[PDB]
Ligand code: HEC
């Protein structure tokens with residue numbers, strides 16, 4: 001499981017691209033707010049493991065390689081907890 | 087330019103996993119409703135090109151390779167138009 005408060009603190013770096021509310025403001029960055037928690041965890045692990053390529057995947061990989069598995073769990077719990085609409 | 091209507095019709099083969107409204111029930115299948123359209127197109131092209139690996143990506147890769155680029159544009163348009171909340 002993840003710590004939502006810890007996830008929210010860690011999300012400060014993520015906000016620049018995915019929005020302060022998990023809703024992106026740029027069309028090429030995905031919304032994360034209210035996404036399935038387990039899927040968020042799987043996606044983060046894939047970026048961290050260099051398993052996602054193409055388009056802007058390298059940009060996101062650069063943002064995931066330095067995350068611990070606990071950071072990943074916290075971040076996913078936090079984003080999943082946000083309302084998908086805001 | 088994706089046709090929402092054509093996308094909605096093509097979506098019947100997607101609904102079993104991603105939900106009829108773009109919100110899934112299975113916690114490892116991501117929600118698609120209200121996601122950024124350009125991102126939806128990029129993610130689909132990535133699966134179609136074998137660019138996403140790890141976890142359950144092979145499952146989605148199997149569902150994307152039979153999609154034409156027009157199908158991808160229509161599907162992204164459709165899902166992006168759906169309300170993120172339902
Ligand atoms: C902009 C410079 C980014 C920063 C800072 C972070 N992310 Fe990101 N992320 C960005 C892009 C370009 C993409 C799409 C890459 C692709 O595969 O085409 C992503 C993707 C994600 C995802 C996947 C979303 C999904 O599959 O629906 C996740 C879960 C994600 N990003 C999380 C995330 C976190 C928690 C970050 C801070 C620690 C973070 N991203 C920063 C761009 C950028």
Ligand code: HEC
Pocket residue numbers: 042043096097099100101102103104114115116117118126129130138140141142143145146149153161
């Ligand atoms: C279940 C058997 C699936 C069917 C039918 C379809 N999709 Fe799917 N999709 C599935 C999984 C397992 C996942 C996650 C893959 C991973 O990388 O872990 C996905 C993912 C997508 C995505 C990526 C969303 C994101 O947030 O990045 C998209 C855009 C997507 N799927 C679209 C989609 C469409 C349009 C389909 C029908 C033509 C389709 N999926 C069917 C599982 C399944």
